[model samples]
Target chain A: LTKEQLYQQAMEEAAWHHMPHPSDSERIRQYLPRNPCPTPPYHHQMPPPHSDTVEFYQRLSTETLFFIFYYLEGTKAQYLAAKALKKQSWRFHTKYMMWFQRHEEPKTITDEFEQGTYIYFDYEKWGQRKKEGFTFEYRYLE
Target chain B: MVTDQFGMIGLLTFIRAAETDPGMVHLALGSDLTTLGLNLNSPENLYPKFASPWASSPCRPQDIDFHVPSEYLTNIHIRDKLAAIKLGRYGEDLLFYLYYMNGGDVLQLLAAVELFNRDWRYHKEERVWITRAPGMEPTMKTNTYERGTYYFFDCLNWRKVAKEFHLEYDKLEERPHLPSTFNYNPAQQAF
Candidate 1:
């Protein structure tokens, strides 16, 4: 299918379930520590918004914020919502890409991961106060 | 929050795109209506990574029309189609960006941020910090799309997990990323 058509279709499902946008405070928060502790209220069970763009030359209009999802010589572009549209340092973001570059499927499953072990991400850095905020460190399980 | 607005890689890409053509831009947004109460969408969820205070204007923030479809897009199709052909400079360069988040790579982790429910449930019957009830559970390599109470076989340690997350629900640190003001004349917009 054409590139535009694909996104057109995907947006369809997204259009159905409407969720509220986050408050200005939470939206402006830094990406490192992750969304301020208890993620801001959902405001009414709204599903998260999804974004991906195509060359809409035929349709050009200045508007809401959109971004560039890059590729290191084109393997797979980045996935922002792997856990809610997140922000990570360029250094760490590169590290994640490198991890994929050198990835080999995990052979062993931690016994704890069995049944239902929930490992967390985003813990290391937020600000000086580590105990006060959430962690961006995916290192705990790593 | 909308931290990715200014953080993450592609610092120049977003800005460059905004400048390169200035107008020929396409951004598609989606929010899954089919949910088993696992992950809910919010405004903060859109635009994975964007620029800080500067980007093209007239992004028609309001023209964006969102809706609920009575006829749904297939789960298989949407999940499979998390990809696109993103063109680069020179008008000749062709690059494809694939959105592959479902991959259970090495650093796979479970987050309590999944549910919309306010408080983390503590199961007293089994005396567990995590609750095993109907909601959503991550399969090894699949995202289940349904609407209802799902019995979750998986769980997490609260004390450790809680600290790793926001311990104070009431405490929210303020942050920022105000869009830049680029004044383009009215004539330029109509054309």
Candidate 2:
């Protein structure tokens, strides 16, 4: 699920990040590099009420290396929803990946191995070529 | 410490770089590799079924069977060379140079050979010897190394089929040896 959807589930479950306004955004934006331009522009200075999941994605980099942590940290409804998706597809959902330059030449920059380009998994799908689902999709600005 | 014994991924990066965007170069899956439980310097044959009948003279059967392990990942280095090896928590590293004596794993063997030689048009001179890794055998190494982009993950499906049904990945590795040492200075842009 995207950030917005996850946030709604958090609000329905009455979970909120009871922190001050500007301070939270400042902390959330810390994961990005120190460029003049911010990646994934933070439209809200403070996430509105029912935006607990908004703060969740914002603080994801600080979370330990498990997606389940993100799920658990959310409201009960959000946790159960993600659990349903997991039950539908664990092979598709529970994979972690790394991205590096795959250029045949040394250190050359190209978009081939960038984010959303599928990395192969050594498993099979339900009687078809396993092309649709990947464990993770990189946001490769690398 | 991660206790990573072999860091060959870092070594191959200097030679076989990643392909153009969204590409995956194929290597053998774990079950398909020959030297399963062996060392790089002296490997034991685990997948002898994949070996070629016409093997090179000095090259041993086990050496040809042995492939570069997949426990490694790639990284671009300061020298613009792709290093194909692994680094452990304690900072130990292992790298693999190209070895095609009694071959078959040439394309899938060394990260350098897979990256550079398989690139379709750049540095043709450096890639000339890649064809010879299989002892002068006329195998279809051409399809994988065409003039466009390439990545090893792209061949995962093809290799799965090859290994599952006993396909011929060794036809290209049956060739003679080269006495001359070729220079490998690729163009600045190619780097």
Candidate 3:
């Protein structure tokens, strides 16, 4: 597939899971990180004012973050599954390629989930920090 | 024998020698093969005496004794598909400018850093460190004061790896500056 097609597909996938009602503040809140770290409370998880486009994008970004988290999660999962089957070739290559190149893989699925959650939290926090107190404003067309 | 401008033996000898040795072929195919040192790209460098150790080949009984660097084989681990191709044509240094240009390589490195930060630990009495993951025995052990220092150093060594890979993760400029409508820009833009 072309690069543009891949990107469009990804955006479409994200949009499919987004908050259908943009004005539903609580629904928007459901997609954000819960811990919301980095002492100053960057308000990363806090919802912006009611705007369909703004909420849609925010939800899409959050969903895309989760998508990436799940993608890595899936890759790690395949590695672990291959590991349990005792495929030495798979184990060796994956260890060198995925972990040993950097470090060991996470031991279990729960830790992986926690790791992903923390990553999303950190990602959102970092995103807000980059924003530097400017809330997103989406201009919706008629 | 035909030679390049520098009077070094030319490409013909190198290609012939590469065809003769699997190890040399691997090096020519896998690496830039020119980044080793001064004039190292000369086809004469393909001679087994100079190339054998660099190519990570075991010394033959008839060859002069040589001390092989432990990392001789580690070069294979540094393989990049792009480098493998470009090096074929120009014998150039693809990794010299950007070692971690491959996103897969970057993800692997970041995952390693994350795992290292989360799992690496040292025991002063054992003089060893291990990657202690949940529910699993710490199989990876390293000596704290001796050769194990590489792992110890690597556990806390994020910046070095990032720098080596041309990854400037700490720089604020490298971080995304979210727009009023961040919807337009994807995080993978930097990736």
- Tens digit of lDDT per residue, candidate 3, span A27-96? 1221111111111112111112221122222322232222222122222222222233222221112112
Per residue, candidate 1 scores C-alpha lDDT tens digits across B84-143 of 322221110010011011111110111222221223332223222232234444333223
- The global Cα lDDT (0 to 1) of model 3 is 0.26
Off by over 4 Å in 2: A1-142, B1-159, B162-171, B175-183, B188-191
**TM-score (C-alpha, index-matched) for candidate 2:** 0.14
Cα error, candidate 1, residue B154 (Å): 44
Of models 2 and 3, which has the larger lDDT? 3
Proportion of native contacts present in model 1: 0.00
Please give, for residues B36-124, the per-residue lDDT of candidate 3 as tens digits. 42344345453544322222221111122223323222224433321222221211011111111111223222322332344433232
Deviation of model 1 at B20, angstroms: 37
Native-referenced DockQ of model 3? 0.01
For candidate 3, the iRMS in Å is 25.1
What's model 2's lDDT at A50?
A: 26
Which consecutive 10 residues in model 1 chain B have the weakest lDDT in total?
A: B90-99
Q: What TM-score does candidate 1 reach? A: 0.15
Candidate 1: lDDT of A31? 14
lDDT of 1 by residue, A34-61 (tens): 1111112211112112223322211111
Q: Give one digit per residue, the lDDT tens place, for model 2 in B1-191.
A: 33342466543552254332223334312122343322234454524322222211122211221222121112111113322122111010011111211122222223223333343111222221222222223333354432222222111121111111111333223222222323211111111
Model 3 RMSD vs true structure: 26.2
- Between 1 and 2, whose lDDT is larger? 2
